[PDB]
Amino acid sequence: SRIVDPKFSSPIVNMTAPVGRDAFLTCVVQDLGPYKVAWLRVDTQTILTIQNHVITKNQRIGIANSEHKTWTMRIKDIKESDKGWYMCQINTDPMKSQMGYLDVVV
Amino acid sequence: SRIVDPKFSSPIVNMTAPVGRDAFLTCVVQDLGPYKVAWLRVDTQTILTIQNHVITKNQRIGIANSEHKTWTMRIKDIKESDKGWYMCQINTDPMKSQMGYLDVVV
Ligand SMILES: *[C@@H]1O[C@H](CO)[C@@H](O)[C@H](O)[C@H]1NC(C)=O
Ligand SMILES: *[C@@H]1O[C@H](CO)[C@@H](O)[C@H](O)[C@H]1NC(C)=O
């Protein structure tokens, strides 16, 4: 039995934030179902989170969701090196994703 | 206490295979410890596996390991669109990774 793919309800909300403040990036998914939402950093090619699990060893990354639709990654105490592109990816076949950015102003 | 990072014992052996055969890529890691090995398709940064869990919906992907040292991703019944670069990634900080290539000949 085939099920619908999840669909993104809105584009990724980007964030601009000063060094040392906390940053958030949010992905809004409709009809997630049995699929999973993963955050990745695109510059560094690094897996950050999958569902409610932080994969990276970086202790400043957190992840939370409400109703499996709004998925918000937290980057605690941001440094200048956190500036870059971040992907919200769903494990459909083919894979679907959208990208946002965190800008760290100096 | 700090622990060692895992280290790759050898490069990933590439593989060339004809359409319809099974293919394998192997990543050999030393001192994995509490860290995790993930396989990704580099073209799109599609998360394929994490540890012994297949993340992608693609039912032709499999993962196995022996003693948390040798990590082997299998691609069953390969197609031309399986040709490309694959990354073996460890969730250290900073992230560590090796890449291999699956060439599919028609
Ligand atoms: C975030 O930035 C990208 C390009 O910089 C843009 O396409 C996207 O729509 C932005 N997000 C929002 C919510 O506007
Ligand atoms: C794998 O392939 C790449 C290019 O296809 C090559 O440069 C590299 O040396 C190969 N790795 C090994 C271990 O042979």
PDB file of all heavy atoms in Angstrom, chain A residues 4-12 26-39 51 65-72 88-92 96-98:
ATOM      1  N   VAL A   4       0.820   8.770   0.932  1.00  0.00           N
ATOM      2  CA  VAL A   4       1.277  10.052   0.422  1.00  0.00           C
ATOM      3  C   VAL A   4       2.661  10.357   0.976  1.00  0.00           C
ATOM      4  O   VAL A   4       3.016   9.961   2.097  1.00  0.00           O
ATOM      5  CB  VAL A   4       0.297  11.184   0.776  1.00  0.00           C
ATOM      6  CG1 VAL A   4      -1.031  10.974   0.089  1.00  0.00           C
ATOM      7  CG2 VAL A   4       0.122  11.292   2.288  1.00  0.00           C
ATOM      8  N   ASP A   5       3.459  11.051   0.175  1.00  0.00           N
ATOM      9  CA  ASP A   5       4.646  11.681   0.712  1.00  0.00           C
ATOM     10  C   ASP A   5       4.234  12.814   1.647  1.00  0.00           C
ATOM     11  O   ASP A   5       3.166  13.409   1.479  1.00  0.00           O
ATOM     12  CB  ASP A   5       5.522  12.237  -0.405  1.00  0.00           C
ATOM     13  CG  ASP A   5       6.298  11.158  -1.124  1.00  0.00           C
ATOM     14  OD1 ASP A   5       6.118   9.969  -0.783  1.00  0.00           O
ATOM     15  OD2 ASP A   5       7.093  11.498  -2.024  1.00  0.00           O
ATOM     16  N   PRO A   6       5.050  13.118   2.651  1.00  0.00           N
ATOM     17  CA  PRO A   6       4.888  14.394   3.348  1.00  0.00           C
ATOM     18  C   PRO A   6       5.167  15.541   2.390  1.00  0.00           C
ATOM     19  O   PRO A   6       5.852  15.390   1.376  1.00  0.00           O
ATOM     20  CB  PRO A   6       5.932  14.334   4.471  1.00  0.00           C
ATOM     21  CG  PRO A   6       6.282  12.887   4.601  1.00  0.00           C
ATOM     22  CD  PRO A   6       6.121  12.297   3.237  1.00  0.00           C
ATOM     23  N   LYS A   7       4.604  16.698   2.707  1.00  0.00           N
ATOM     24  CA  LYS A   7       4.871  17.908   1.950  1.00  0.00           C
ATOM     25  C   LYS A   7       5.218  19.032   2.912  1.00  0.00           C
ATOM     26  O   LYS A   7       4.706  19.095   4.035  1.00  0.00           O
ATOM     27  CB  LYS A   7       3.676  18.317   1.075  1.00  0.00           C
ATOM     28  CG  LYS A   7       2.384  18.545   1.837  1.00  0.00           C
ATOM     29  CD  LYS A   7       1.250  18.949   0.895  1.00  0.00           C
ATOM     30  CE  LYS A   7       1.345  20.415   0.490  1.00  0.00           C
ATOM     31  NZ  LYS A   7       0.305  20.775  -0.518  1.00  0.00           N
ATOM     32  N   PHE A   8       6.109  19.907   2.467  1.00  0.00           N
ATOM     33  CA  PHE A   8       6.459  21.084   3.244  1.00  0.00           C
ATOM     34  C   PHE A   8       5.314  22.086   3.183  1.00  0.00           C
ATOM     35  O   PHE A   8       4.804  22.394   2.101  1.00  0.00           O
ATOM     36  CB  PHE A   8       7.752  21.706   2.721  1.00  0.00           C
ATOM     37  CG  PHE A   8       8.944  20.799   2.830  1.00  0.00           C
ATOM     38  CD1 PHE A   8       9.409  20.099   1.730  1.00  0.00           C
ATOM     39  CD2 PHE A   8       9.603  20.648   4.041  1.00  0.00           C
ATOM     40  CE1 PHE A   8      10.504  19.266   1.831  1.00  0.00           C
ATOM     41  CE2 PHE A   8      10.700  19.814   4.148  1.00  0.00           C
ATOM     42  CZ  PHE A   8      11.150  19.122   3.041  1.00  0.00           C
ATOM     43  N   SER A   9       4.904  22.582   4.349  1.00  0.00           N
ATOM     44  CA  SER A   9       3.770  23.497   4.406  1.00  0.00           C
ATOM     45  C   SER A   9       4.171  24.930   4.084  1.00  0.00           C
ATOM     46  O   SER A   9       3.326  25.725   3.657  1.00  0.00           O
ATOM     47  CB  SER A   9       3.117  23.434   5.788  1.00  0.00           C
ATOM     48  OG  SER A   9       2.829  22.097   6.156  1.00  0.00           O
ATOM     49  N   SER A  10       5.441  25.274   4.276  1.00  0.00           N
ATOM     50  CA  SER A  10       5.938  26.622   4.048  1.00  0.00           C
ATOM     51  C   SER A  10       7.454  26.551   3.920  1.00  0.00           C
ATOM     52  O   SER A  10       8.069  25.578   4.368  1.00  0.00           O
ATOM     53  CB  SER A  10       5.528  27.565   5.192  1.00  0.00           C
ATOM     54  OG  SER A  10       5.772  26.968   6.454  1.00  0.00           O
ATOM     55  N   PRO A  11       8.080  27.551   3.303  1.00  0.00           N
ATOM     56  CA  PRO A  11       9.544  27.537   3.190  1.00  0.00           C
ATOM     57  C   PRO A  11      10.218  27.664   4.549  1.00  0.00           C
ATOM     58  O   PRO A  11       9.617  28.076   5.544  1.00  0.00           O
ATOM     59  CB  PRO A  11       9.850  28.748   2.302  1.00  0.00           C
ATOM     60  CG  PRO A  11       8.649  29.628   2.421  1.00  0.00           C
ATOM     61  CD  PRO A  11       7.486  28.700   2.596  1.00  0.00           C
ATOM     62  N   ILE A  12      11.501  27.296   4.572  1.00  0.00           N
ATOM     63  CA  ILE A  12      12.290  27.348   5.798  1.00  0.00           C
ATOM     64  C   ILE A  12      12.427  28.794   6.251  1.00  0.00           C
ATOM     65  O   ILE A  12      12.792  29.674   5.462  1.00  0.00           O
ATOM     66  CB  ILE A  12      13.671  26.713   5.575  1.00  0.00           C
ATOM     67  CG1 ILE A  12      13.546  25.238   5.197  1.00  0.00           C
ATOM     68  CG2 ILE A  12      14.531  26.864   6.818  1.00  0.00           C
ATOM     69  CD1 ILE A  12      13.334  24.323   6.374  1.00  0.00           C
ATOM     70  N   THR A  26      13.496  26.531  11.471  1.00  0.00           N
ATOM     71  CA  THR A  26      12.257  25.773  11.595  1.00  0.00           C
ATOM     72  C   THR A  26      11.783  25.276  10.239  1.00  0.00           C
ATOM     73  O   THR A  26      11.773  26.024   9.256  1.00  0.00           O
ATOM     74  CB  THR A  26      11.165  26.615  12.264  1.00  0.00           C
ATOM     75  OG1 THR A  26      11.504  26.827  13.640  1.00  0.00           O
ATOM     76  CG2 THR A  26       9.822  25.924  12.185  1.00  0.00           C
ATOM     77  N   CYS A  27      11.385  24.006  10.210  1.00  0.00           N
ATOM     78  CA  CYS A  27      10.862  23.317   9.041  1.00  0.00           C
ATOM     79  C   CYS A  27       9.454  22.840   9.364  1.00  0.00           C
ATOM     80  O   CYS A  27       9.235  22.221  10.409  1.00  0.00           O
ATOM     81  CB  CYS A  27      11.777  22.135   8.691  1.00  0.00           C
ATOM     82  SG  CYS A  27      11.433  21.213   7.202  1.00  0.00           S
ATOM     83  N   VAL A  28       8.506  23.116   8.472  1.00  0.00           N
ATOM     84  CA  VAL A  28       7.098  22.811   8.709  1.00  0.00           C
ATOM     85  C   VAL A  28       6.656  21.758   7.704  1.00  0.00           C
ATOM     86  O   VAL A  28       6.648  22.010   6.493  1.00  0.00           O
ATOM     87  CB  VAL A  28       6.218  24.066   8.627  1.00  0.00           C
ATOM     88  CG1 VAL A  28       4.814  23.745   9.104  1.00  0.00           C
ATOM     89  CG2 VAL A  28       6.827  25.192   9.478  1.00  0.00           C
ATOM     90  N   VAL A  29       6.272  20.588   8.208  1.00  0.00           N
ATOM     91  CA  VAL A  29       5.982  19.416   7.389  1.00  0.00           C
ATOM     92  C   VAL A  29       4.535  19.002   7.612  1.00  0.00           C
ATOM     93  O   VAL A  29       4.064  18.954   8.755  1.00  0.00           O
ATOM     94  CB  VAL A  29       6.935  18.254   7.722  1.00  0.00           C
ATOM     95  CG1 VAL A  29       6.578  17.012   6.921  1.00  0.00           C
ATOM     96  CG2 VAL A  29       8.372  18.658   7.459  1.00  0.00           C
ATOM     97  N   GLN A  30       3.837  18.695   6.527  1.00  0.00           N
ATOM     98  CA  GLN A  30       2.477  18.184   6.582  1.00  0.00           C
ATOM     99  C   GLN A  30       2.471  16.719   6.164  1.00  0.00           C
ATOM    100  O   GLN A  30       3.140  16.340   5.197  1.00  0.00           O
ATOM    101  CB  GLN A  30       1.553  19.004   5.678  1.00  0.00           C
ATOM    102  CG  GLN A  30       0.187  18.404   5.454  1.00  0.00           C
ATOM    103  CD  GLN A  30      -0.636  19.204   4.466  1.00  0.00           C
ATOM    104  OE1 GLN A  30      -0.390  20.392   4.250  1.00  0.00           O
ATOM    105  NE2 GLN A  30      -1.614  18.553   3.853  1.00  0.00           N
ATOM    106  N   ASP A  31       1.725  15.898   6.911  1.00  0.00           N
ATOM    107  CA  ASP A  31       1.578  14.465   6.632  1.00  0.00           C
ATOM    108  C   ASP A  31       2.916  13.734   6.723  1.00  0.00           C
ATOM    109  O   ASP A  31       3.277  12.970   5.827  1.00  0.00           O
ATOM    110  CB  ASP A  31       0.926  14.219   5.267  1.00  0.00           C
ATOM    111  CG  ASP A  31      -0.505  14.707   5.204  1.00  0.00           C
ATOM    112  OD1 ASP A  31      -1.269  14.457   6.157  1.00  0.00           O
ATOM    113  OD2 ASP A  31      -0.870  15.342   4.193  1.00  0.00           O
ATOM    114  N   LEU A  32       3.656  13.972   7.808  1.00  0.00           N
ATOM    115  CA  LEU A  32       4.930  13.283   7.995  1.00  0.00           C
ATOM    116  C   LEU A  32       4.732  11.772   8.026  1.00  0.00           C
ATOM    117  O   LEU A  32       5.450  11.023   7.351  1.00  0.00           O
ATOM    118  CB  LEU A  32       5.610  13.766   9.277  1.00  0.00           C
ATOM    119  CG  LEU A  32       6.976  13.128   9.542  1.00  0.00           C
ATOM    120  CD1 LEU A  32       7.972  13.516   8.459  1.00  0.00           C
ATOM    121  CD2 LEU A  32       7.506  13.504  10.918  1.00  0.00           C
ATOM    122  N   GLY A  33       3.750  11.308   8.795  1.00  0.00           N
ATOM    123  CA  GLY A  33       3.452   9.900   8.898  1.00  0.00           C
ATOM    124  C   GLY A  33       4.589   9.100   9.497  1.00  0.00           C
ATOM    125  O   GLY A  33       5.135   9.439  10.551  1.00  0.00           O
ATOM    126  N   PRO A  34       4.962   8.005   8.831  1.00  0.00           N
ATOM    127  CA  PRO A  34       6.085   7.185   9.303  1.00  0.00           C
ATOM    128  C   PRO A  34       7.451   7.691   8.867  1.00  0.00           C
ATOM    129  O   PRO A  34       8.465   7.100   9.259  1.00  0.00           O
ATOM    130  CB  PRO A  34       5.784   5.820   8.676  1.00  0.00           C
ATOM    131  CG  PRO A  34       5.112   6.166   7.388  1.00  0.00           C
ATOM    132  CD  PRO A  34       4.292   7.408   7.664  1.00  0.00           C
ATOM    133  N   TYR A  35       7.509   8.757   8.074  1.00  0.00           N
ATOM    134  CA  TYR A  35       8.779   9.288   7.612  1.00  0.00           C
ATOM    135  C   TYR A  35       9.466  10.093   8.715  1.00  0.00           C
ATOM    136  O   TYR A  35       8.893  10.371   9.772  1.00  0.00           O
ATOM    137  CB  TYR A  35       8.573  10.145   6.365  1.00  0.00           C
ATOM    138  CG  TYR A  35       8.117   9.346   5.170  1.00  0.00           C
ATOM    139  CD1 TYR A  35       6.772   9.265   4.834  1.00  0.00           C
ATOM    140  CD2 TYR A  35       9.031   8.661   4.381  1.00  0.00           C
ATOM    141  CE1 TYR A  35       6.351   8.531   3.741  1.00  0.00           C
ATOM    142  CE2 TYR A  35       8.621   7.925   3.290  1.00  0.00           C
ATOM    143  CZ  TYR A  35       7.281   7.863   2.974  1.00  0.00           C
ATOM    144  OH  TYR A  35       6.865   7.134   1.888  1.00  0.00           O
ATOM    145  N   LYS A  36      10.716  10.467   8.456  1.00  0.00           N
ATOM    146  CA  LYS A  36      11.541  11.154   9.437  1.00  0.00           C
ATOM    147  C   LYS A  36      12.092  12.450   8.862  1.00  0.00           C
ATOM    148  O   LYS A  36      12.356  12.557   7.660  1.00  0.00           O
ATOM    149  CB  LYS A  36      12.704  10.267   9.905  1.00  0.00           C
ATOM    150  CG  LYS A  36      12.267   8.925  10.468  1.00  0.00           C
ATOM    151  CD  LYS A  36      13.416   8.200  11.150  1.00  0.00           C
ATOM    152  CE  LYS A  36      12.983   6.824  11.624  1.00  0.00           C
ATOM    153  NZ  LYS A  36      11.680   6.877  12.338  1.00  0.00           N
ATOM    154  N   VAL A  37      12.274  13.432   9.740  1.00  0.00           N
ATOM    155  CA  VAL A  37      12.830  14.730   9.380  1.00  0.00           C
ATOM    156  C   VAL A  37      14.257  14.806   9.902  1.00  0.00           C
ATOM    157  O   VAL A  37      14.506  14.557  11.089  1.00  0.00           O
ATOM    158  CB  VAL A  37      11.975  15.877   9.942  1.00  0.00           C
ATOM    159  CG1 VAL A  37      12.682  17.215   9.758  1.00  0.00           C
ATOM    160  CG2 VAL A  37      10.601  15.884   9.264  1.00  0.00           C
ATOM    161  N   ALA A  38      15.190  15.162   9.024  1.00  0.00           N
ATOM    162  CA  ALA A  38      16.599  15.270   9.376  1.00  0.00           C
ATOM    163  C   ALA A  38      17.123  16.656   9.024  1.00  0.00           C
ATOM    164  O   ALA A  38      16.797  17.206   7.967  1.00  0.00           O
ATOM    165  CB  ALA A  38      17.431  14.202   8.660  1.00  0.00           C
ATOM    166  N   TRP A  39      17.935  17.215   9.917  1.00  0.00           N
ATOM    167  CA  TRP A  39      18.644  18.461   9.662  1.00  0.00           C
ATOM    168  C   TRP A  39      20.096  18.156   9.319  1.00  0.00           C
ATOM    169  O   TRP A  39      20.739  17.322   9.964  1.00  0.00           O
ATOM    170  CB  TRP A  39      18.582  19.399  10.869  1.00  0.00           C
ATOM    171  CG  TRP A  39      17.273  20.120  11.035  1.00  0.00           C
ATOM    172  CD1 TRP A  39      16.242  19.768  11.850  1.00  0.00           C
ATOM    173  CD2 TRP A  39      16.871  21.324  10.376  1.00  0.00           C
ATOM    174  NE1 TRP A  39      15.216  20.675  11.737  1.00  0.00           N
ATOM    175  CE2 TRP A  39      15.579  21.642  10.836  1.00  0.00           C
ATOM    176  CE3 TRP A  39      17.479  22.162   9.437  1.00  0.00           C
ATOM    177  CZ2 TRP A  39      14.882  22.764  10.392  1.00  0.00           C
ATOM    178  CZ3 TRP A  39      16.783  23.277   8.996  1.00  0.00           C
ATOM    179  CH2 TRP A  39      15.502  23.566   9.473  1.00  0.00           C
ATOM    180  N   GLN A  51      14.944  13.070  13.294  1.00  0.00           N
ATOM    181  CA  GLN A  51      13.760  13.075  14.163  1.00  0.00           C
ATOM    182  C   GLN A  51      14.125  13.858  15.426  1.00  0.00           C
ATOM    183  O   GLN A  51      14.631  14.983  15.311  1.00  0.00           O
ATOM    184  CB  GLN A  51      13.282  11.644  14.382  1.00  0.00           C
ATOM    185  CG  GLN A  51      11.786  11.512  14.682  1.00  0.00           C
ATOM    186  CD  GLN A  51      10.896  11.685  13.452  1.00  0.00           C
ATOM    187  OE1 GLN A  51      11.256  12.371  12.493  1.00  0.00           O
ATOM    188  NE2 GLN A  51       9.725  11.061  13.481  1.00  0.00           N
ATOM    189  N   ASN A  65      10.046  19.306  18.280  1.00  0.00           N
ATOM    190  CA  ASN A  65       8.915  19.365  17.370  1.00  0.00           C
ATOM    191  C   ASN A  65       7.623  19.467  18.165  1.00  0.00           C
ATOM    192  O   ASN A  65       7.569  19.150  19.356  1.00  0.00           O
ATOM    193  CB  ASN A  65       8.859  18.144  16.440  1.00  0.00           C
ATOM    194  CG  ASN A  65       8.296  16.910  17.128  1.00  0.00           C
ATOM    195  OD1 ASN A  65       9.032  16.132  17.732  1.00  0.00           O
ATOM    196  ND2 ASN A  65       6.981  16.726  17.034  1.00  0.00           N
ATOM    197  N   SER A  66       6.574  19.917  17.480  1.00  0.00           N
ATOM    198  CA  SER A  66       5.215  19.892  18.004  1.00  0.00           C
ATOM    199  C   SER A  66       4.319  19.293  16.933  1.00  0.00           C
ATOM    200  O   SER A  66       4.292  19.785  15.800  1.00  0.00           O
ATOM    201  CB  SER A  66       4.735  21.293  18.400  1.00  0.00           C
ATOM    202  OG  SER A  66       4.743  22.173  17.291  1.00  0.00           O
ATOM    203  N   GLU A  67       3.618  18.213  17.282  1.00  0.00           N
ATOM    204  CA  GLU A  67       2.668  17.525  16.410  1.00  0.00           C
ATOM    205  C   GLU A  67       3.313  16.937  15.157  1.00  0.00           C
ATOM    206  O   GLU A  67       2.612  16.670  14.174  1.00  0.00           O
ATOM    207  CB  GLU A  67       1.514  18.445  15.998  1.00  0.00           C
ATOM    208  CG  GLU A  67       0.742  19.053  17.150  1.00  0.00           C
ATOM    209  CD  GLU A  67      -0.564  19.674  16.695  1.00  0.00           C
ATOM    210  OE1 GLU A  67      -1.414  18.935  16.157  1.00  0.00           O
ATOM    211  OE2 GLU A  67      -0.738  20.900  16.862  1.00  0.00           O
ATOM    212  N   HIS A  68       4.629  16.724  15.166  1.00  0.00           N
ATOM    213  CA  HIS A  68       5.373  16.185  14.024  1.00  0.00           C
ATOM    214  C   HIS A  68       5.244  17.055  12.776  1.00  0.00           C
ATOM    215  O   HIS A  68       5.517  16.590  11.663  1.00  0.00           O
ATOM    216  CB  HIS A  68       4.948  14.747  13.698  1.00  0.00           C
ATOM    217  CG  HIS A  68       5.717  13.699  14.441  1.00  0.00           C
ATOM    218  ND1 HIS A  68       5.707  12.369  14.074  1.00  0.00           N
ATOM    219  CD2 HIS A  68       6.523  13.783  15.526  1.00  0.00           C
ATOM    220  CE1 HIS A  68       6.472  11.680  14.903  1.00  0.00           C
ATOM    221  NE2 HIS A  68       6.979  12.514  15.793  1.00  0.00           N
ATOM    222  N   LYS A  69       4.831  18.311  12.925  1.00  0.00           N
ATOM    223  CA  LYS A  69       4.733  19.221  11.791  1.00  0.00           C
ATOM    224  C   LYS A  69       5.761  20.339  11.838  1.00  0.00           C
ATOM    225  O   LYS A  69       6.446  20.588  10.843  1.00  0.00           O
ATOM    226  CB  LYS A  69       3.316  19.811  11.695  1.00  0.00           C
ATOM    227  CG  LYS A  69       2.656  20.102  13.024  1.00  0.00           C
ATOM    228  CD  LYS A  69       1.161  20.339  12.842  1.00  0.00           C
ATOM    229  CE  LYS A  69       0.500  19.168  12.124  1.00  0.00           C
ATOM    230  NZ  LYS A  69      -0.985  19.297  12.086  1.00  0.00           N
ATOM    231  N   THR A  70       5.893  21.022  12.969  1.00  0.00           N
ATOM    232  CA  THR A  70       6.898  22.063  13.130  1.00  0.00           C
ATOM    233  C   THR A  70       8.148  21.454  13.755  1.00  0.00           C
ATOM    234  O   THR A  70       8.119  21.036  14.916  1.00  0.00           O
ATOM    235  CB  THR A  70       6.364  23.196  14.004  1.00  0.00           C
ATOM    236  OG1 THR A  70       5.192  23.767  13.404  1.00  0.00           O
ATOM    237  CG2 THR A  70       7.418  24.273  14.182  1.00  0.00           C
ATOM    238  N   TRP A  71       9.245  21.417  12.996  1.00  0.00           N
ATOM    239  CA  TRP A  71      10.524  20.900  13.473  1.00  0.00           C
ATOM    240  C   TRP A  71      11.520  22.052  13.567  1.00  0.00           C
ATOM    241  O   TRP A  71      11.871  22.659  12.550  1.00  0.00           O
ATOM    242  CB  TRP A  71      11.055  19.798  12.553  1.00  0.00           C
ATOM    243  CG  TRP A  71      10.192  18.574  12.530  1.00  0.00           C
ATOM    244  CD1 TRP A  71       9.058  18.389  11.800  1.00  0.00           C
ATOM    245  CD2 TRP A  71      10.385  17.370  13.283  1.00  0.00           C
ATOM    246  NE1 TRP A  71       8.532  17.144  12.044  1.00  0.00           N
ATOM    247  CE2 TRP A  71       9.329  16.498  12.952  1.00  0.00           C
ATOM    248  CE3 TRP A  71      11.349  16.945  14.202  1.00  0.00           C
ATOM    249  CZ2 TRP A  71       9.211  15.225  13.508  1.00  0.00           C
ATOM    250  CZ3 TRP A  71      11.230  15.681  14.753  1.00  0.00           C
ATOM    251  CH2 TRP A  71      10.167  14.837  14.404  1.00  0.00           C
ATOM    252  N   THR A  72      11.969  22.349  14.783  1.00  0.00           N
ATOM    253  CA  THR A  72      12.824  23.498  15.047  1.00  0.00           C
ATOM    254  C   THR A  72      14.148  23.016  15.615  1.00  0.00           C
ATOM    255  O   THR A  72      14.177  22.377  16.672  1.00  0.00           O
ATOM    256  CB  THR A  72      12.151  24.472  16.016  1.00  0.00           C
ATOM    257  OG1 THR A  72      11.007  25.068  15.387  1.00  0.00           O
ATOM    258  CG2 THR A  72      13.134  25.556  16.432  1.00  0.00           C
ATOM    259  N   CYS A  88      16.604  20.768   5.625  1.00  0.00           N
ATOM    260  CA  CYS A  88      15.579  19.951   6.267  1.00  0.00           C
ATOM    261  C   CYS A  88      15.160  18.885   5.265  1.00  0.00           C
ATOM    262  O   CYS A  88      14.559  19.200   4.234  1.00  0.00           O
ATOM    263  CB  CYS A  88      14.385  20.798   6.696  1.00  0.00           C
ATOM    264  SG  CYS A  88      12.933  19.847   7.201  1.00  0.00           S
ATOM    265  N   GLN A  89      15.489  17.631   5.556  1.00  0.00           N
ATOM    266  CA  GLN A  89      15.384  16.548   4.588  1.00  0.00           C
ATOM    267  C   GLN A  89      14.435  15.475   5.097  1.00  0.00           C
ATOM    268  O   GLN A  89      14.493  15.097   6.271  1.00  0.00           O
ATOM    269  CB  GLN A  89      16.767  15.950   4.311  1.00  0.00           C
ATOM    270  CG  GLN A  89      16.754  14.571   3.686  1.00  0.00           C
ATOM    271  CD  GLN A  89      18.152  14.011   3.491  1.00  0.00           C
ATOM    272  OE1 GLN A  89      18.394  12.825   3.716  1.00  0.00           O
ATOM    273  NE2 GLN A  89      19.078  14.864   3.072  1.00  0.00           N
ATOM    274  N   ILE A  90      13.575  14.975   4.211  1.00  0.00           N
ATOM    275  CA  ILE A  90      12.647  13.895   4.524  1.00  0.00           C
ATOM    276  C   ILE A  90      13.077  12.657   3.749  1.00  0.00           C
ATOM    277  O   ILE A  90      13.398  12.740   2.558  1.00  0.00           O
ATOM    278  CB  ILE A  90      11.197  14.285   4.178  1.00  0.00           C
ATOM    279  CG1 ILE A  90      10.871  15.665   4.758  1.00  0.00           C
ATOM    280  CG2 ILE A  90      10.227  13.236   4.701  1.00  0.00           C
ATOM    281  CD1 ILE A  90       9.506  16.174   4.368  1.00  0.00           C
ATOM    282  N   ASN A  91      13.065  11.502   4.418  1.00  0.00           N
ATOM    283  CA  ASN A  91      13.547  10.258   3.815  1.00  0.00           C
ATOM    284  C   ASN A  91      12.537   9.600   2.878  1.00  0.00           C
ATOM    285  O   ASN A  91      12.383   8.376   2.886  1.00  0.00           O
ATOM    286  CB  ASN A  91      13.978   9.292   4.917  1.00  0.00           C
ATOM    287  CG  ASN A  91      12.849   8.926   5.854  1.00  0.00           C
ATOM    288  OD1 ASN A  91      11.856   9.643   5.965  1.00  0.00           O
ATOM    289  ND2 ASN A  91      12.999   7.800   6.543  1.00  0.00           N
ATOM    290  N   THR A  92      11.842  10.389   2.062  1.00  0.00           N
ATOM    291  CA  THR A  92      11.056   9.841   0.970  1.00  0.00           C
ATOM    292  C   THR A  92      11.981   9.277  -0.111  1.00  0.00           C
ATOM    293  O   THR A  92      13.203   9.442  -0.075  1.00  0.00           O
ATOM    294  CB  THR A  92      10.153  10.917   0.368  1.00  0.00           C
ATOM    295  OG1 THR A  92      10.929  12.099   0.120  1.00  0.00           O
ATOM    296  CG2 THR A  92       9.001  11.246   1.309  1.00  0.00           C
ATOM    297  N   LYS A  96      13.234  14.375  -0.544  1.00  0.00           N
ATOM    298  CA  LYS A  96      12.794  15.752  -0.681  1.00  0.00           C
ATOM    299  C   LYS A  96      13.300  16.569   0.500  1.00  0.00           C
ATOM    300  O   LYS A  96      13.448  16.062   1.618  1.00  0.00           O
ATOM    301  CB  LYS A  96      11.267  15.851  -0.801  1.00  0.00           C
ATOM    302  CG  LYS A  96      10.482  15.206   0.321  1.00  0.00           C
ATOM    303  CD  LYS A  96       9.032  14.983  -0.105  1.00  0.00           C
ATOM    304  CE  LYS A  96       8.447  16.230  -0.749  1.00  0.00           C
ATOM    305  NZ  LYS A  96       6.988  16.086  -1.023  1.00  0.00           N
ATOM    306  N   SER A  97      13.573  17.843   0.232  1.00  0.00           N
ATOM    307  CA  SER A  97      14.248  18.703   1.191  1.00  0.00           C
ATOM    308  C   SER A  97      13.978  20.155   0.828  1.00  0.00           C
ATOM    309  O   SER A  97      13.497  20.467  -0.263  1.00  0.00           O
ATOM    310  CB  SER A  97      15.754  18.427   1.212  1.00  0.00           C
ATOM    311  OG  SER A  97      16.317  18.620  -0.076  1.00  0.00           O
ATOM    312  N   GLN A  98      14.286  21.039   1.773  1.00  0.00           N
ATOM    313  CA  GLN A  98      14.399  22.461   1.501  1.00  0.00           C
ATOM    314  C   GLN A  98      15.542  23.015   2.340  1.00  0.00           C
ATOM    315  O   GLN A  98      15.936  22.431   3.354  1.00  0.00           O
ATOM    316  CB  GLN A  98      13.093  23.220   1.779  1.00  0.00           C
ATOM    317  CG  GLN A  98      12.344  22.787   3.020  1.00  0.00           C
ATOM    318  CD  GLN A  98      11.079  23.597   3.223  1.00  0.00           C
ATOM    319  OE1 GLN A  98      10.649  23.834   4.352  1.00  0.00           O
ATOM    320  NE2 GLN A  98      10.479  24.032   2.122  1.00  0.00           N
TER     321      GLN A  98
END
